């Protein structure tokens, strides 16, 4: 079969610019500024042999960004700066001062307790639809049952967290 | 669950139409067997955290402590404990349904517990680490009061005080589970959440799904090949769908059980095999030690904490 592939758009937010780039996944650049990646064919971006930390992920170690005119660029992500610790068998480092940081750590605990009536969602009010849903028996008690379990369970989560 | 028997009763004409629906029910056969491996593996990871078996010494001299309530008696046929006997009485076809037994019998489950019981009585925490290393139980609390910052004179100068309070604490445990049935509801839900899904799995065969009859043998007996094939077509989608609905309910609940199990064996690790610093993790209070007991489909820990009281006020500096 002649070539195909998924298509995805690399872009920054629209409150900065409307410039874009395109990623033709799993299909290289002999069939569609151009850049060949192991993700696919990337068009609309310019390769740079500097390494800036990731801002948009793409695949295969490539990340994109929109920096200064101005354009989309592609690059191989850095992993932080190259460094090394001095070492010997007779040298140590001890602090002389310190600092108190405060980290933020957010977690979710619950979500909205949604409950749905099957008969409502399928049949507006119609008795005919309801009769023909009855003859499926008791599927849609199972669905209400599961949602009810979720609804109780989301209260239990909050209780366990905060009522310590 | 046999896929063929629940979808089709005995007619090969039903079985012919299932075959040209591809390899559906083998996948459902696969993942339920995938559950079947996980259930044995969860039992494998919880109680077989020990290399070998240790049964208790025959002497019951322990400086006043009693463990007859948690040790199994040799008097019973099934060598289980009385608390386990309290825990073993407070918990109460032909359509592909098949109860494959668990890998280990509960006597064998009792073997691991009694093994974990004895070395925890007799070898400190050390047996979980390497080779077992013996100790008087009067001194093992003297390890553990150092674990929460208590000088070990306080143990030794009030040994008789602690032991009777430890004894009467066990009598409350024997009391609270031999009278009330509400606290066993956590295990009771799991069997009930299992059991409700079984009954609603079978009862879907009473549904037509827009057929002239919900039973299969009537449609085979009163119609020809062509017109009943449409009626059987409606019978498969909905029975198969309920089966897939049954699998999806089983899988998600299994992951909760899978999430339950690793929490348990870590508490078998952190709170039975040794003395965790982690507060609010095994009971309420500064954690001292624990004892595991057998349970149907479950485990019951008995945690021992150090809860202080009777304070005064104190000017500090």
């Amino acid at each position: 079969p002649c070539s195909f592939g998924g298509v995805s758009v690399i872009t920054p937010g629209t409150n900065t610019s409307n410039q874009v780039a395109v990623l033709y996944q799993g299909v290289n650049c002999t069939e569609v500024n151009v850049f060949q990646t192991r993700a696919g064919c990337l068009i609309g971006a310019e390769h740079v042999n500097n390494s800036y930390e990731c801002d948009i992920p793409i695949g295969a170690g490539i990340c994109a960004s929109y920096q200064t005119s101005q354009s989309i660029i592609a690059y191989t992500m850095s992993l932080g700066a190259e460094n090394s610790v001095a070492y010997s068998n007779n040298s140590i480092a001890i602090p002389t001062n310190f600092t108190i940081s405060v980290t933020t750590e957010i977690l979710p605990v619950s979500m909205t307790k949604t409950s749905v009536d099957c008969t409502m969602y399928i049949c507006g009010d119609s008795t005919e639809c309801s009769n023909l849903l009855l003859q499926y028996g008791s599927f849609c008690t199972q669905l209400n049952r599961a949602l009810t379990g979720i609804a109780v369970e989301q209260d239990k989560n909050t209780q366990e967290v905060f009522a310590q | 669950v046999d896929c063929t028997m629940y979808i089709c009763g005995d007619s090969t004409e039903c079985s012919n139409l299932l075959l040209q629906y591809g390899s559906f029910c083998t996948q459902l056969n696969r993942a339920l067997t995938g559950i079947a491996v996980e259930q044995d593996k969860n039992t494998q990871e919880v109680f077989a955290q020990v290399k070998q078996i240790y049964k208790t010494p025959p002497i019951k001299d322990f400086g006043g402590f009693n463990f007859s309530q948690i040790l199994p008696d040799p008097s019973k046929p099934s060598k289980r404990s009385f608390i386990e006997d309290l825990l073993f009485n407070k918990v109460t076809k032909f359509n592909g349904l098949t109860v494959l037994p668990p890998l280990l019998t509960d006597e064998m489950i009792a073997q691991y517990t009694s093994a974990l019981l004895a070395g925890t009585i007799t070898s400190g925490w050390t047996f979980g680490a390497g080779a077992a290393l013996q100790i008087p139980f009067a001194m093992q609390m003297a390890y553990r009061f150092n674990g929460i910052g208590v000088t070990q004179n306080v143990l030794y100068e009030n040994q008789k005080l602690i032991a009777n309070q430890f004894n009467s604490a066990i009598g409350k445990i024997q009391d609270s589970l031999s009278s009330t049935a509400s606290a066993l509801g956590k295990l009771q839900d799991v069997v009930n959440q299992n059991a409700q899904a079984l009954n609603t799995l079978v009862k879907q065969l009473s549904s037509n799904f827009g057929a002239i009859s919900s039973v299969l043998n009537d449609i085979l007996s009163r119609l020809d090949k062509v017109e009943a094939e449409v009626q059987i077509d409606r019978l498969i989608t909905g029975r198969l769908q309920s089966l897939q609905t049954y699998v999806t309910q089983q899988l998600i609940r299994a992951a909760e059980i899978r999430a339950s199990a690793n929490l348990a064996a870590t508490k078998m690790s952190e709170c039975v095999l040794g003395q965790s610093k982690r507060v609010d993790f095994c009971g309420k209070g500064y954690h001292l030690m624990s004892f595991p007991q057998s349970a149907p489909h479950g485990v019951v820990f008995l945690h021992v904490t150090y809860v202080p009281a009777q304070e005064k006020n104190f000017t500090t500096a």
Binding site: - | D2, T4, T26, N29, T33
Partner: protein, 98 residues
């Protein structure tokens, strides 16, 4: 049982382990069929072996309802001149009935 594992594991060197792969049942043997203790007996001896016989102008439309008429004894007697059933076999008009 060696290559019965090969019937669904799609390979040759099956690995040491259990493989739930096959089933069985028990075949039916006799297929017995039961009914109530028959004892119902539509009166035919008063309409076939009767004494008072009529003509065609005064045909009494007499009612037969809610019993069983054994047509099987009206077959092997074999003394008939115009035994003709229109649209139904004599085999299963005891099986389907009006």
């Amino acid at each position: 049982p060696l290559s019965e594992t090969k019937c669904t594991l799609k390979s040759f060197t099956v690995e040491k382990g259990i493989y739930q792969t096959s089933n069985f049942r028990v075949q039916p043997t006799e297929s017995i069929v039961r009914f109530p203790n028959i004892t119902n007996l539509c009166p035919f001896g008063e309409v076939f072996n009767a004494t008072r016989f009529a003509s065609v102008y005064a045909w009494n439309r007499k009612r037969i309802s809610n019993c069983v008429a054994d047509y099987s004894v009206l077959y092997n007697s074999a003394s008939f001149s115009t035994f003709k059933c229109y649209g139904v076999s004599p085999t299963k008009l005891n099986d389907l009935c009006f």
